[PDB]
Design a protein around this ligand. Structure first.
Ligand SMILES: CN(CC[C@H](N)CC(=O)N[C@H]1C=C[C@H](n2ccc(N)nc2=O)O[C@@H]1C(=O)O)C(=N)N
Ligand SMILES: [Mg+2]
Ligand SMILES: [Mg+2]
Ligand SMILES: [Mg+2]
Ligand SMILES: [Mg+2]
Ligand SMILES: [Mg+2]
Ligand SMILES: [Mg+2]
Ligand SMILES: [Mg+2]
Ligand SMILES: [Mg+2]
Ligand SMILES: [Mg+2]
Ligand SMILES: [Mg+2]
Ligand SMILES: [Mg+2]
Ligand SMILES: [Mg+2]
Ligand SMILES: [Mg+2]
Ligand SMILES: [Mg+2]
Ligand SMILES: [Mg+2]
Ligand SMILES: [Mg+2]
Ligand SMILES: [Mg+2]
Ligand SMILES: [Mg+2]
Ligand SMILES: [Mg+2]
Ligand SMILES: [Mg+2]
Ligand SMILES: [Mg+2]
Ligand SMILES: [Mg+2]
Ligand SMILES: [Mg+2]
Ligand SMILES: [Mg+2]
Ligand SMILES: [Mg+2]
Ligand SMILES: [Mg+2]
Ligand SMILES: [Mg+2]
Ligand SMILES: [Mg+2]
Ligand SMILES: [Mg+2]
Ligand SMILES: [Mg+2]
Ligand SMILES: [Mg+2]
Ligand SMILES: [Mg+2]
Ligand SMILES: [Mg+2]
Ligand SMILES: [Mg+2]
Ligand SMILES: [Mg+2]
Ligand SMILES: [Mg+2]
Ligand SMILES: [Mg+2]
Ligand SMILES: [Mg+2]
Ligand SMILES: [Mg+2]
Ligand SMILES: [Mg+2]
Ligand SMILES: [Mg+2]
Ligand SMILES: [Mg+2]
Ligand SMILES: [Mg+2]
Ligand SMILES: [Mg+2]
Ligand SMILES: [Mg+2]
Ligand SMILES: [Mg+2]
Ligand SMILES: [Mg+2]
Ligand SMILES: [Mg+2]
Ligand SMILES: [Mg+2]
Ligand SMILES: [Mg+2]
Ligand SMILES: [Mg+2]
Ligand SMILES: [Mg+2]
Ligand SMILES: [Mg+2]
Ligand SMILES: [Mg+2]
Ligand SMILES: [Mg+2]
Ligand SMILES: [Mg+2]
Ligand SMILES: [Mg+2]
Ligand SMILES: [Mg+2]
Ligand SMILES: [Mg+2]
Ligand SMILES: [Mg+2]
Ligand SMILES: [Mg+2]
Ligand SMILES: [Mg+2]
Ligand SMILES: [Mg+2]
Ligand SMILES: [Mg+2]
Ligand SMILES: [Mg+2]
Ligand SMILES: [Mg+2]
Ligand SMILES: [Mg+2]
Ligand SMILES: [Mg+2]
Ligand SMILES: [Mg+2]
Ligand SMILES: [Mg+2]
Ligand SMILES: [Mg+2]
Ligand SMILES: [Mg+2]
Ligand SMILES: [Mg+2]
Ligand SMILES: [Mg+2]
Ligand SMILES: [Mg+2]
Ligand SMILES: [Mg+2]
Ligand SMILES: [Mg+2]
Ligand SMILES: [Mg+2]
Ligand SMILES: [Mg+2]
Ligand SMILES: [Mg+2]
Ligand SMILES: [Mg+2]
Ligand SMILES: [Mg+2]
Ligand SMILES: [Mg+2]
Ligand SMILES: [Mg+2]
Ligand SMILES: [Mg+2]
Ligand SMILES: [Mg+2]
Ligand SMILES: [Mg+2]
Ligand SMILES: [Mg+2]
Ligand SMILES: [Mg+2]
Ligand SMILES: [Mg+2]
Ligand SMILES: [Mg+2]
Ligand SMILES: [Mg+2]
Ligand SMILES: [Mg+2]
Ligand SMILES: [Mg+2]
Ligand SMILES: [Mg+2]
Ligand SMILES: [Mg+2]
Ligand SMILES: [Mg+2]
Ligand SMILES: [Mg+2]
Ligand SMILES: [Mg+2]
Ligand SMILES: [Mg+2]
Ligand SMILES: [Mg+2]
Ligand SMILES: [Mg+2]
Ligand SMILES: [Mg+2]
Ligand SMILES: [Mg+2]
Ligand SMILES: [Mg+2]
Ligand SMILES: [Mg+2]
Ligand SMILES: [Mg+2]
Ligand SMILES: [Mg+2]
Ligand SMILES: [Mg+2]
Ligand SMILES: [Mg+2]
Ligand SMILES: [Mg+2]
Ligand SMILES: [Mg+2]
Ligand SMILES: [Mg+2]
Ligand SMILES: [Mg+2]
Ligand SMILES: [Mg+2]
Ligand SMILES: [Mg+2]
Ligand SMILES: [Mg+2]
Ligand SMILES: [Mg+2]
Ligand SMILES: [Mg+2]
Ligand SMILES: [Mg+2]
Ligand SMILES: [Mg+2]
Ligand SMILES: [Mg+2]
Ligand SMILES: [Mg+2]
Ligand SMILES: [Mg+2]
Ligand SMILES: [Mg+2]
Ligand SMILES: [Mg+2]
Ligand SMILES: [Mg+2]
Ligand SMILES: [Mg+2]
Ligand SMILES: [Mg+2]
Ligand SMILES: [Mg+2]
Ligand SMILES: [Mg+2]
Ligand SMILES: [Mg+2]
Ligand SMILES: [Mg+2]
Ligand SMILES: [Mg+2]
Ligand SMILES: [Mg+2]
Ligand SMILES: [Mg+2]
Ligand SMILES: [Mg+2]
Ligand SMILES: [Mg+2]
Ligand SMILES: [Mg+2]
Ligand SMILES: [Mg+2]
Ligand SMILES: [Mg+2]
Ligand SMILES: [Mg+2]
Ligand SMILES: [Mg+2]
Ligand SMILES: [Mg+2]
Ligand SMILES: [Mg+2]
Ligand SMILES: [Mg+2]
Ligand SMILES: [Mg+2]
Ligand SMILES: [Mg+2]
Ligand SMILES: [Mg+2]
Ligand SMILES: [Mg+2]
Ligand SMILES: [Mg+2]
Ligand SMILES: [Mg+2]
Ligand SMILES: [Mg+2]
Ligand SMILES: [Mg+2]
Ligand SMILES: [Mg+2]
Ligand SMILES: [Mg+2]
Ligand SMILES: [Mg+2]
Ligand SMILES: [Mg+2]
Ligand SMILES: [Mg+2]
Ligand SMILES: [Mg+2]
Ligand SMILES: [Mg+2]
Ligand SMILES: [Mg+2]
Ligand SMILES: [Mg+2]
Ligand SMILES: [Mg+2]
Ligand SMILES: [Mg+2]
Ligand SMILES: [Mg+2]
Ligand SMILES: [Mg+2]
Ligand SMILES: [Mg+2]
Ligand SMILES: [Mg+2]
Ligand SMILES: [Mg+2]
Ligand SMILES: [Mg+2]
Ligand SMILES: [Mg+2]
Ligand SMILES: [Mg+2]
Ligand SMILES: [Mg+2]
Ligand SMILES: [Mg+2]
Ligand SMILES: [Mg+2]
Ligand SMILES: [Mg+2]
Ligand SMILES: [Mg+2]
Ligand SMILES: [Mg+2]
Ligand SMILES: [Mg+2]
Ligand SMILES: [Mg+2]
Ligand SMILES: [Mg+2]
Ligand SMILES: [Mg+2]
Ligand SMILES: [Mg+2]
Ligand SMILES: [Mg+2]
Ligand SMILES: [Mg+2]
Ligand SMILES: [Mg+2]
Lengths: 181, 134, 76, 30, 98, 44
RNA sequence: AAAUG
RNA sequence: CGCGGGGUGGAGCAGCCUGGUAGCUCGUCGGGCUCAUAACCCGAAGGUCGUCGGUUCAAAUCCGGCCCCCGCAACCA
RNA sequence: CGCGGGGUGGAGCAGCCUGGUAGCUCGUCGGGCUCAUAACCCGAAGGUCGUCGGUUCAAAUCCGGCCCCCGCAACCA
RNA sequence: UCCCCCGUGCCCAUAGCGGCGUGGAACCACCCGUUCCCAUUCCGAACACGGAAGUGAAACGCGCCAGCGCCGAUGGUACUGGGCGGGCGACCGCCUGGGAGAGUAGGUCGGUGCGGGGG
RNA sequence: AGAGCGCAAGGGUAGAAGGGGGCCUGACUGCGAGGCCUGCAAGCCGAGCAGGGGCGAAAGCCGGGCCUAGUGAACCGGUGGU
RNA sequence: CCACCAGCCUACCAAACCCUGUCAAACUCCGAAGGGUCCCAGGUGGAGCCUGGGAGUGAGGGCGCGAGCGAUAACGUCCGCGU
């Protein structure tokens, strides 16, 4: 499937607006969403893989896309690490799979949140890319209470094509990111 | 220091590199004969200068004793001398600049440096600062 | 005095220089790693030993970022 | 796959996701 | 990523170098050790139709024509950065008929 | 732990070395006898 | 089984 | 390398004999008595009786292979 | 200096060989029995594992260096 | 014969980093789509296939600046085959032939072989 | 390229020798031109031929491991085969 | 002074980095003289090579030079090149 709000909203609203602020010669010079990497860090699931495969289907479900099992490298003896036993699911969203995700995130996930007041404005990594963390994971749509075994949220990395911060900063604002300012 | 282990001895070939040029002060003490200078020599020479012009300008030591000096415990002929009795010394070829003073006049500098000459196991010469800078 | 010890010194090095005639199989260089690389008519064994693949003269070559190579330009 | 994001606060969003069963108590409009 | 090129070289001779553009594909048998090309059956930038794979097998046989005429046979195939498949494969499919 | 690979439908052998406790209870890799040609071999 | 002030 | 007899509860062990019984001791928990401490007494939780196959209605018990330990005797170019 | 052994809560010892997990007795501390003390009963606290560096995912533990303590030796005809 | 592009090899940084500018006819890339071949420890990102619309932004090609990087003499010295001379020595000096490293002056935003396509 | 390459150091190495996956067992048999090293005995490298195979579309690669330690003449006997 | 905070900065201890200035058998971006080997040439010399018979030698020493050990001691010691 390839057709919905954020896609259009970006092309038939965000796309031109941006051009009014910075005025790009060429079409591609325009900032552009194109990558969203969700990633939990359940080092706790190191032992019991029960929680492992479960959060894996929770994750793959909220995103619709298949989940990848991240592996370890060095060794945090200070918390039971060696080669690659541990895990931390990671899915990478692009094209429409991404859009459809951002649809729920902006209209459902972000909305119902234990005291929401805005996203951190400083969270821009100095290059057209934003990062945010979620505590609860049931704040996503199809996650009923009788389904959650425990609070195991994650963090999302959103990638753009913009160089400067405030340049991409606007890009997410126009899309629907409620920055705390 | 820190480094690693005891050194071989090595000869003291010509004053080739062993030699420099004043580069910190108004006057300098320079070696004429080659030799290992003990740490405890550097010390005595240094203090001899500060001890001289009390509350004086600034002393500049330009050679650092990084060579491990060995020595046998008064025995026969085997193993390598644990030694270090004198501990460490710095190789010094003729022409090498040892000390430099500054923030003091001629008489202060001349006398103080001269004193170091008597603290050193070497024939030495004092130097002004000519005008030679590369 | 835990020292005073070593290991039978292996006579390794360039065993045939440039401008020398070699028969097929002749060892050209016994080396630690690939301080020399193979090349035209010169294969090397599991130890890195470069050896002639055919008869001919041996000629060396260098290639900076690409390293040094031994060759055997034949003619007989 | 369609989806009925019937927000409790009047709003009734609609997008794409597995199973059309959705009933957000309060979404981006409250 | 050109590691493959190195392998094929120190092995024999007559490299069937094969480049292929988003809308093109080229092939030239070259005798290295001096760096010279023997035959060059260009494709989309020559005259052929529109279906990439269909085009490939044509040029493959095409190269064989002119190549084998001059007396050639070393099928040392330079599978460029491209995985041996489809278009590049069909290109081979061709020479493997001509 | 030393090992000599016996042949099936025969009694050939081959120089070898098992590893016992480390994941190795079933050694049955291939080989090639002078008697006949090419056959599978047991542990033993 | 239970010493001392 | 051959021969001999062992694995049973948290620990030690009977039961194996010859098929229908898993017990005892201390240990752990509760209770009884106690200056205290044991002693004593009551009750209690806890063992595919090594492993995989086999005869049997039914074995840890008889059988075969094997894992591990203990021991016996011999050898060591 | 050379060979061997040892530095661990206040005292005296175990753990090291077989890397992960601070153990025992006494003392100390709070509370009980006594008119009170002790004994006795019930609880708790207390370690930087001499020291520096290295190995290791991780060091009281393996490795090397220096310091301290204990025994022997340092023949010298 | 001359210019531009594409594939490829040689020299192996004077070929590089950076900065500015330029090219889309062709070429190339980017790009459109995921049905067929093929693919993701997830994702058509990558590999792959079918291909128009768009663009030269990215990448790439070409061209400029010497900030970094890189190259770097001449002269002189070190050092040293060989031949000599001087002190107790740690050492020192001459003849003869060879002759660095560093540093100075300077150079450098490449050169070139083959094949194909376009003017 | 200061990481990695099982372990010591070294040399080597990302244009892989490092990391991941698919299929596999050439940690083959019978040989072996020509050499490195060398007092002897040993030690090391090895193209190629034949047989029967593995992976690859193919050119090809495979007679263990990036390499240099991880070892023991003869004698005497055990065991399996001819 | 300011502690529930601060920076230029302090005659205060210092990682990283930068400038000045240096050191190293087990450090090298560099790097000689020389040494080794091969090809061509001169070289007829108690030269050279091959096969065999006969040996002795296997405590060496001093000196020059290059290093280790030693104490930049020894008619010291241990190797290297030469005599
Ligand atoms: C005390 N003795 C020694 C008897 C001998 N036959 C004679 C004798 O005196 N030998 C001695 C001779 C010197 C010897 N010695 C001493 C010091 C030294 N550095 N090296 C030596 O050889 O030590 C010997 C020694 O006393 O045993 C007996 N009980 N036998
Ligand atoms: Mg990852
Ligand atoms: Mg964990
Ligand atoms: Mg897409
Ligand atoms: Mg004077
Ligand atoms: Mg300067
Ligand atoms: Mg200078
Ligand atoms: Mg040692
Ligand atoms: Mg030695
Ligand atoms: Mg030696
Ligand atoms: Mg040879
Ligand atoms: Mg091989
Ligand atoms: Mg190998
Ligand atoms: Mg040359
Ligand atoms: Mg290169
Ligand atoms: Mg190509
Ligand atoms: Mg073993
Ligand atoms: Mg063994
Ligand atoms: Mg094995
Ligand atoms: Mg085999
Ligand atoms: Mg036979
Ligand atoms: Mg009394
Ligand atoms: Mg026997
Ligand atoms: Mg035996
Ligand atoms: Mg046995
Ligand atoms: Mg018996
Ligand atoms: Mg029963
Ligand atoms: Mg009873
Ligand atoms: Mg218990
Ligand atoms: Mg008791
Ligand atoms: Mg009782
Ligand atoms: Mg049961
Ligand atoms: Mg049972
Ligand atoms: Mg069972
Ligand atoms: Mg006994
Ligand atoms: Mg017996
Ligand atoms: Mg026997
Ligand atoms: Mg025995
Ligand atoms: Mg000890
Ligand atoms: Mg002991
Ligand atoms: Mg003690
Ligand atoms: Mg201890
Ligand atoms: Mg203690
Ligand atoms: Mg103490
Ligand atoms: Mg004890
Ligand atoms: Mg104990
Ligand atoms: Mg004990
Ligand atoms: Mg112990
Ligand atoms: Mg020990
Ligand atoms: Mg251990
Ligand atoms: Mg106590
Ligand atoms: Mg008390
Ligand atoms: Mg009390
Ligand atoms: Mg009372
Ligand atoms: Mg009391
Ligand atoms: Mg009292
Ligand atoms: Mg405690
Ligand atoms: Mg302690
Ligand atoms: Mg200690
Ligand atoms: Mg220690
Ligand atoms: Mg310790
Ligand atoms: Mg511990
Ligand atoms: Mg120890
Ligand atoms: Mg005496
Ligand atoms: Mg005497
Ligand atoms: Mg005596
Ligand atoms: Mg014309
Ligand atoms: Mg013309
Ligand atoms: Mg011409
Ligand atoms: Mg021209
Ligand atoms: Mg070109
Ligand atoms: Mg060329
Ligand atoms: Mg760049
Ligand atoms: Mg432009
Ligand atoms: Mg323009
Ligand atoms: Mg166009
Ligand atoms: Mg479209
Ligand atoms: Mg379709
Ligand atoms: Mg389909
Ligand atoms: Mg993976
Ligand atoms: Mg998969
Ligand atoms: Mg695509
Ligand atoms: Mg592609
Ligand atoms: Mg197209
Ligand atoms: Mg176009
Ligand atoms: Mg551009
Ligand atoms: Mg731009
Ligand atoms: Mg240009
Ligand atoms: Mg260019
Ligand atoms: Mg400039
Ligand atoms: Mg400049
Ligand atoms: Mg000149
Ligand atoms: Mg010069
Ligand atoms: Mg000159
Ligand atoms: Mg001279
Ligand atoms: Mg005189
Ligand atoms: Mg003297
Ligand atoms: Mg002399
Ligand atoms: Mg000259
Ligand atoms: Mg010159
Ligand atoms: Mg030179
Ligand atoms: Mg210089
Ligand atoms: Mg300098
Ligand atoms: Mg000059
Ligand atoms: Mg450029
Ligand atoms: Mg240039
Ligand atoms: Mg130019
Ligand atoms: Mg030029
Ligand atoms: Mg050309
Ligand atoms: Mg042309
Ligand atoms: Mg063209
Ligand atoms: Mg024209
Ligand atoms: Mg014209
Ligand atoms: Mg680097
Ligand atoms: Mg390395
Ligand atoms: Mg690794
Ligand atoms: Mg190291
Ligand atoms: Mg290395
Ligand atoms: Mg390489
Ligand atoms: Mg590889
Ligand atoms: Mg691997
Ligand atoms: Mg691999
Ligand atoms: Mg695999
Ligand atoms: Mg594999
Ligand atoms: Mg798998
Ligand atoms: Mg032959
Ligand atoms: Mg031979
Ligand atoms: Mg041979
Ligand atoms: Mg030889
Ligand atoms: Mg031999
Ligand atoms: Mg002999
Ligand atoms: Mg032999
Ligand atoms: Mg060996
Ligand atoms: Mg072979
Ligand atoms: Mg085959
Ligand atoms: Mg073919
Ligand atoms: Mg082979
Ligand atoms: Mg191999
Ligand atoms: Mg390996
Ligand atoms: Mg391998
Ligand atoms: Mg041995
Ligand atoms: Mg042995
Ligand atoms: Mg052995
Ligand atoms: Mg033997
Ligand atoms: Mg005998
Ligand atoms: Mg026999
Ligand atoms: Mg027999
Ligand atoms: Mg305060
Ligand atoms: Mg206050
Ligand atoms: Mg505060
Ligand atoms: Mg506070
Ligand atoms: Mg506070
Ligand atoms: Mg406070
Ligand atoms: Mg306050
Ligand atoms: Mg406060
Ligand atoms: Mg600092
Ligand atoms: Mg300081
Ligand atoms: Mg620094
Ligand atoms: Mg030395
Ligand atoms: Mg070292
Ligand atoms: Mg260098
Ligand atoms: Mg230079
Ligand atoms: Mg030279
Ligand atoms: Mg030379
Ligand atoms: Mg020469
Ligand atoms: Mg000749
Ligand atoms: Mg001649
Ligand atoms: Mg004659
Ligand atoms: Mg004659
Ligand atoms: Mg003669
Ligand atoms: Mg004579
Ligand atoms: Mg001859
Ligand atoms: Mg002979
Ligand atoms: Mg003779
Ligand atoms: Mg004879
Ligand atoms: Mg003799
Ligand atoms: Mg001898
Ligand atoms: Mg002698
Ligand atoms: Mg002798
Ligand atoms: Mg001699
Ligand atoms: Mg001599
Ligand atoms: Mg001498
Ligand atoms: Mg001399
Ligand atoms: Mg030296
Ligand atoms: Mg000396
Ligand atoms: Mg003397
Ligand atoms: Mg001497
Ligand atoms: Mg020597």
């Amino acid at each position: 499937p390839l057709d919905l709000a954020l896609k259009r909203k970006y092309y038939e609203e965000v796309r031109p607006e941006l051009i009014r602020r910075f005025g790009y010669q060429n079409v591609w010079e325009v900032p552009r969403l194109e990558k969203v990497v969700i990633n939990q860090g359940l080092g706790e699931a190191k032992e019991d893989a029960r929680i492992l495969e479960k959060a894996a289907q929770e994750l793959a479900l909220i995103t619709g896309q298949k989940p990848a099992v991240t592996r370890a490298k060095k060794s945090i003896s200070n918390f039971k690490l060696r080669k690659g036993m541990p895990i931390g699911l990671r899915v990478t969203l692009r094209r429409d799979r991404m859009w459809i995700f951002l649809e729920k995130l902006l209209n459902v996930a972000l909305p119902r949140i234990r005291d929401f007041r805005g996203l951190n404005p400083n969270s821009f990594d100095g290059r057209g890319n934003y990062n945010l963390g979620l505590r609860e994971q049931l704040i996503f749509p199809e996650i009923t209470y009788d389904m959650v075994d425990a609070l195991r949220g994650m963090d999302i990395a959103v990638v753009t094509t913009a160089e400067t911060d405030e340049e991409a900063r606007a890009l997410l604002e126009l899309l629907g990111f409620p920055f705390r300012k | 220091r820190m480094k690693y282990r005891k050194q071989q001895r090595g000869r003291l070939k010509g004053a080739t590199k062993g030699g420099d040029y004043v580069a910190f002060g108004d006057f300098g003490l320079v070696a004429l004969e080659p030799a290992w200078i003990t740490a405890q020599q550097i010390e005595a020479a240094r203090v001899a200068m500060v001890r001289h012009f009390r509350r004086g300008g600034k002393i500049f030591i330009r050679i650092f004793p990084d060579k491990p000096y060995t020595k046998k415990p008064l025995e026969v002929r085997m193993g390598k001398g644990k030694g270090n009795v004198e501990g460490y010394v710095a190789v010094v070829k003729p022409g090498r600049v040892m000390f430099e003073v500054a923030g003091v006049t001629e008489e202060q500098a001349m006398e103080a440096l001269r004193i170091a000459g008597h603290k050193l196991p070497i024939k030495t010469k004092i130097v002004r600062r000519d005008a030679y800078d590369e | 005095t835990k020292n005073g010890r070593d290991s039978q010194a292996k006579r390794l090095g360039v065993k045939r220089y440039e401008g020398q005639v070699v028969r097929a199989g002749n060892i050209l260089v016994r080396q630690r790693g690939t301080r020399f690389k193979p090349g035209k008519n010169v294969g090397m064994g599991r130890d890195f030993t470069l050896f002639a693949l055919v008869d001919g003269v041996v000629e060396f070559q260098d290639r900076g970022r690409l390293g040094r190579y031994v060759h055997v330009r034949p003619l007989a | 796959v369609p989806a009925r994001i019937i927000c409790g606060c009047g709003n009734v969003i609609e997008t794409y996701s597995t199973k059309p069963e959705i009933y957000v108590e309060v979404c981006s409009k409250c | 990523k050109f590691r493959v090129r190195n392998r094929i070289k120190r092995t024999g001779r007559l490299r069937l170098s094969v480049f292929r553009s988003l809308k093109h594909i080229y092939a030239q048998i070259i005798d290295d050790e001096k760096g010279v090309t023997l035959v060059s059956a260009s494709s989309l930038a020559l005259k052929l139709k529109g279906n990439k794979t269909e085009v490939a097998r044509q040029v493959g046989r095409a190269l064989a024509e002119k190549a084998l005429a001059l007396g050639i046979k070393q099928v040392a195939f330079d599978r460029g950065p491209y995985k041996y498949h489809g278009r590049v494969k069909a290109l081979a499919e061709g020479a493997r008929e001509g | 732990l030393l090992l000599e690979c016996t042949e099936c439908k025969r009694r050939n052998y081959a120089t070898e070395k098992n590893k016992r406790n480390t994941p190795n209870k079933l050694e049955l890799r291939k080989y090639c006898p002078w008697c006949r040609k090419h056959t599978v071999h047991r542990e033993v």
